[PDB]
Amino acid sequence: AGCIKNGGRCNASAGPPYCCSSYCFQIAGQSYGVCKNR
Secondary structure: OOOOOOOEEEOOOOOOOOOOOOEEEEEOOOOEEEEEOO
């Protein structure tokens, strides 16, 4: 599906599918990750 390189949304705690540039930054608090370049 579509994705965002400079600000994508992902979730490594609920089945991480794939980000726009293979990167995903998530922290341990609300279960939220952001995608970026590599």
